[PDB]
Design an enzyme around this catalytic site. Structure first.
Site, short mmCIF file in Angstrom:
data_model
loop_
_atom_site.label_atom_id
_atom_site.label_comp_id
_atom_site.label_asym_id
_atom_site.label_seq_id
_atom_site.Cartn_x
_atom_site.Cartn_y
_atom_site.Cartn_z
N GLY A 186 0.82 -1.21 0.00
CA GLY A 186 0.00 0.00 0.00
C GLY A 186 0.86 1.28 0.00
O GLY A 186 0.49 2.26 -0.62
N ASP A 187 2.00 1.22 0.73
CA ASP A 187 2.92 2.35 0.63
C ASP A 187 3.39 2.61 -0.81
O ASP A 187 3.29 3.79 -1.27
CB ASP A 187 4.13 2.24 1.58
CG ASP A 187 4.97 0.99 1.47
OD1 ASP A 187 4.47 0.02 0.78
OD2 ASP A 187 6.06 0.87 2.04
N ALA A 188 3.77 1.53 -1.49
CA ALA A 188 4.22 1.71 -2.88
C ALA A 188 3.10 2.26 -3.77
O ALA A 188 3.35 3.08 -4.67
CB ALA A 188 4.68 0.35 -3.40
#
Ligand SMILES: [Mg+2]
Ligand SMILES: [Mg+2]
Length: 238
Positions: A186-188
């Site tokens: 999700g960060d990416a």
């Protein structure tokens, strides 16, 4: 406050105190700390509880329960978007319940955005220590400006102006992507959204640290790093 630090917590009672302590002892103190807990177990809530007495802590607990609700969305992305909508800081940064900020992280990141108005997103280096004593040290560097942050820069290594959030929502409809196909990275996926509009500028110092020593069957097939990196190479912003 100058900074809003957004921390997500879910069931990591053995690690969350060191994480919260590392933020509350920062040498730059003018922040608000969102502790967005996803309706964790009692042992974890017992660890968090004493830190709620710090007046900078903004604690929000969901009422989520069961595999359907836990897999409907990438939950930490939904909790970050909730905290963004309440944030009052000019600069936004992210933290988690098993990552440690080094003491001068906020001071150094705030100074770099205050000194350079042309930079909207900055990132530092990060270190991970593997224990078994240390058997291995891993470092994710911050040596170059990049228009392709997905899977190269971690969730906990960035700071950005609040104004970045407006461009992302105008294009995509939300800040972080709550699709459950982006649970693993999700960060990416959020950095992929940001890299439609802004490059990430480096601060070449190790300012965050990690230590490493029925749910999964109900998520959908996970989208991966190669997908995101190739779409940004095709987009051709840098
Ligand atoms: Mg202000
Ligand atoms: Mg990750």
């Amino acid at each position: 406050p100058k900074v809003s630090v957004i921390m997500t917590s879910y069931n990591k009672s053995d690690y969350v105190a060191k994480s919260i302590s590392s933020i509350l002892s920062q040498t730059f103190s003018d922040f608000e700390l969102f502790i967005m807990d996803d309706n964790s177990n009692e042992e974890t809530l017992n660890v968090i509880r004493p830190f709620l007495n710090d007046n900078r802590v903004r604690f929000y607990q969901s009422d989520i329960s069961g595999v359907k609700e836990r897999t409907e969305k990438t939950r930490y992305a939904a909790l970050i978007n909730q905290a963004i909508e309440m944030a009052e800081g000019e600069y936004i940064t992210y933290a988690t319940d098993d990552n440690i900020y080094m003491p001068d992280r906020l001071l150094k990141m705030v100074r770099e955005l205050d000194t350079h108005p042309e930079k909207a997103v900055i990132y530092s280096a990060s270190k991970t220590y593997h224990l078994n004593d240390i058997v291995k040290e891993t470092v994710r560097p911050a040596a170059q400006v990049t228009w392709n942050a997905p899977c190269a820069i971690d969730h906990c290594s960035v700071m950005h102006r609040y104004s970045v959030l407006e461009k992302v929502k105008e294009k995509f409809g939300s800040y972080w992507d709550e699709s459950p196909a982006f649970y693993r990275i999700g960060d990416a996926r959020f950095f992929w959204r940001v890299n439609h509009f802004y490059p990430f500028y480096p601060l070449d110092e190790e300012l965050d640290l990690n230590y490493i020593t029925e749910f999964v069957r109900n998520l959908p097939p996970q989208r991966n790093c190669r997908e995101l990196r190739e779409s940004l190479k095709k987009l051709g912003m840098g």
